[PDB]
């Protein structure tokens, strides 16, 4: 019966391929062929933040466009003030192999995690006046790749054991678990309404999940190597993916098909971080050749280059009002561009 | 305005306190050496770690030689795939690679792992300290027969022992021949690439060796010496 199951799977894959071929009416380039080019985009460094001792692995903006969180492999978590470059807090971590960090929308809690397979939560508004550990979430069998906040009481986690999870912070238990990937999940991004979320794995695939029911609705393919960056379009009906084959792609959700690809001949190194802008017209992506590129999503022609970092770029971030772009690289420096 | 300055003064004093603490932390952080331990299940990498220790998933070890502190890590709470979490250890002083020499059918896997580590994009500037374990088992294997290394490697029949060898006081020539043949196999691929950016240090060890800490100390001293030669324009 196993051979029959394989034949049935192949036949249904053929039917799916025929359906996706039927859906593809016209190319994105043909529709976006007359719009004005963005032009030359030259940003300059406005603030340089120093104080970290080792390479920076992740960062996140607060929901005020003023406060920032940075994580480095030296084992420290620094909360800055971008306007005056004043360090607001410094937190020593128990484990120095930290791979992600997050900022709660309310602004009272901060989460972190890494190779220890544990998500740690710290409280910022303690009545005493000191940051302290509030709750540790455990249950993952692999390293944490990303973590995002839904409310003050719920969190979403993606691990290297090909699984994602939803946690209720108050009781510290898993409510739902999402499975189905073959390789390690590298990143995730929450929807604007916090009802769906997408995740890309090291099997050259991406999957869309519904938070409440806990099921996989759509899976997208097209890359030929590991996907190591993902985000969400401001509209909430598309997303962008970067892989190790040195090319970016844009995927939709109601068409269930790839839309656009960004590539160049001189680019051999892959992408590490991808972030959008407020309007949805600019795509910022950092590479391993020590700089970042600013692509125009609609035209798929490079419009800007950000240079100045002396090592591999690891993290990108954009404010909620689109007034600053923060880049963190392996040279222990955070740079703000406007 | 009064509130503005009344808050800026507090912000400045807090920043000064944090900066002082950060400098104090940097002083300690800059004087500690980090090492990453790699090997296979058959290889007794833990037992040497236990020996130096006596002398969450991630095993941690701290030891001290000549008032210099060394920190060793062991990642074992993950899956077989390791092409993503190994990029974290790119600023490590040196990688301690443990190899099983007694088993022949597992030697090709160790050679392939060593070759993959050698040619990595993010591991081209990190030296590797090679520990060939299980010398007694290899000696018992070759001496008693019933197992021919020629079957696994047909280049063992046209191999002659190099002259610049230092056999132990009491030892059969065949044992020395095979033992140095394994090291020659591992060192053949270590010299094809690498423009003097890293070097492989080979050593022979057993299950009762109590001298690995000094070996690592000397190798780290040589690595730091090379880095200082490059840094101080002495080349």
């Amino acid at each position, epitope marked *: 019966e196993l051979d029959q199951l394989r034949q049935e799977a192949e036949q249904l894959k053929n039917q799916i391929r025929d359906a996706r071929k039927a859906c593809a009416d016209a190319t994105l380039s043909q529709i976006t062929n007359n719009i004005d080019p963005v032009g030359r985009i030259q940003m300059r460094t406005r603030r340089t933040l120093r104080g970290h001792l080792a390479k920076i692995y992740a960062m996140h903006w607060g929901t005020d466009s003023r406060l920032l969180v940075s994580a480095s492999q030296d084992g420290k978590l620094i909360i800055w003030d971008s306007y005056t470059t004043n360090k607001v807090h410094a937190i020593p971590l128990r484990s120095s192999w930290v791979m992600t960090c997050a900022y709660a929308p309310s602004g009272n809690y901060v989460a972190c995690g890494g190779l220890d397979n544990i998500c740690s939560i710290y409280n910022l508004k303690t009545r005493e006046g000191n940051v302290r550990v509030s709750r540790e979430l455990a249950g993952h069998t692999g390293y944490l790749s990303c973590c995002r906040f839904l409310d003050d009481n719920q969190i979403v986690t993606s691990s290297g054991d090909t699984t994602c999870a939803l946690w209720d912070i108050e009781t510290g238990q898993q409510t739902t678990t999402f499975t189905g990937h*073959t*390789g390690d999940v590298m990143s995730l991004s929450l929807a604007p309404d916090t009802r769906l979320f997408v995740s890309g794995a*090291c*099997d*050259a695939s991406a999957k869309l999940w519904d938070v409440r029911e806990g099921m996989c609705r759509q899976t997208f*393919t*097209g890359h*030929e*190597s*590991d996907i190591n960056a993902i985000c969400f379009f401001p509209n909430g009906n598309a997303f962008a993916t970067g892989s*190790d*084959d*040195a090319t970016c792609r844009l995927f939709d959700l109601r068409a269930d098909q790839e839309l656009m690809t960004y590539s160049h001949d001189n680019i*051999i190194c*892959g992408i590490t971080s991808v972030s959008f802008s407020k309007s949805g017209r600019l795509l910022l992506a950092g590479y391993d050749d020590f700089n970042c590129n600013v692509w125009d999503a609609l035209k798929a022609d490079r419009a800007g280059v950000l240079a100045g970092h002396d090592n591999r770029v690891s993290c990108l971030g954009v404010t909620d009002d689109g007034m600053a772009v923060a880049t963190g690289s392996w040279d222990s420096f955070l740079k703000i561009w406007n | 305005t009064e509130d503005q300055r009344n808050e800026e003064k507090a912000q400045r004093e807090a920043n000064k306190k944090i900066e002082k603490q950060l400098q104090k932390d940097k002083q300690v952080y800059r004087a500690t050496h980090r090492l990453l331990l790699l090997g296979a299940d058959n290889s007794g990498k833990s037992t040497i770690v236990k020996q130096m220790r006596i002398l969450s998933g991630i095993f941690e070890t701290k030891f001290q030689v000549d008032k210099v502190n060394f920190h060793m890590f062991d990642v074992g709470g993950q899956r*077989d*795939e*390791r*092409r993503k979490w*190994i990029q974290c250890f790119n600023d490590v002083t040196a990688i301690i690679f443990v190899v099983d020499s007694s088993d022949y059918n597992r030697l*090709q*896997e160790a050679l*392939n792992l060593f*070759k*993959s*580590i*050698w*040619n*990595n*994009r993010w591991l081209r500037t990190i030296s590797v300290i090679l520990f060939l374990n299980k010398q007694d088992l290899l000696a018992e294997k070759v001496l008693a027969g019933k197992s021919k290394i020629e*079957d*696994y*490697f*047909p*280049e063992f029949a046209r191999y002659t022992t190099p002259e610049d060898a230092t056999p132990e006081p009491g030892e059969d020539p065949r044992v020395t021949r095979a033992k140095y043949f394994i090291r020659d196999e591992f060192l053949r691929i270590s010299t094809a*690439s690498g423009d003097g950016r890293h070097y492989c240090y080979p050593h022979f060890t057993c299950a009762v060796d109590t001298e690995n800490a000094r070996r690592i100390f000397n190798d780290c001293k040589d690595i730091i010496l090379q880095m200082n030669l490059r840094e101080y324009n002495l080349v």
Partner: nanobody, 126 residues
Framework: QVQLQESGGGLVQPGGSLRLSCAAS????????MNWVRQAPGKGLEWVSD????????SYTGSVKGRFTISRDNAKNTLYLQMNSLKPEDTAVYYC?????????????????????RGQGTQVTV
């Protein structure tokens, strides 16, 4: 979608010959190093041979050093394994394996319990 499909196989006797062909689809064929692996009953996966992007560098294991031959064809995106003088230690499932990253001289995971880019395999018996 990445696809690597084996072919060939059959029943032979000690001292026979049979060529194995792997077809590929879904990626550029010349940027990736390729390997041959086999899995025989009672043990785990093992490595056999590898070939580079162009066709110059070639490596075997000792147990098959003087017997088998590898080849690759970029025009037809095919991987060939010539196999002769068989001995009762070759019955296994044969997977052709891709290197995860392009334009690199090394890659880590080719022989793992679960690997993304592999083939179903073919069974050959002596």
């Amino acid at each position: 979608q990445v696809q690597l499909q084996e072919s060939g196989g059959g029943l032979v006797q000690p001292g026979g010959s049979l060529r194995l062909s792997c077809a590929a689809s879904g990626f550029t064929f010349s940027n990736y190093k390729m390997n041959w692996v086999r899995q025989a009953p009672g043990k785990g996966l093992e490595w056999v041979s590898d070939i580079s992007q162009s066709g110059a560098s070639i490596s075997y294991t000792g147990s098959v050093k003087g017997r088998f031959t590898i080849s690759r064809d970029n025009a037809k995106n095919t991987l060939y394994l010539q196999m002769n003088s068989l001995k009762p230690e070759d019955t296994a499932v044969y997977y052709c394996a891709r290197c995860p990253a392009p334009f690199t001289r090394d890659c880590f995971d080719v022989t793992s319990t679960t690997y993304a880019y592999r083939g179903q395999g073919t069974q050959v018996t002596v």
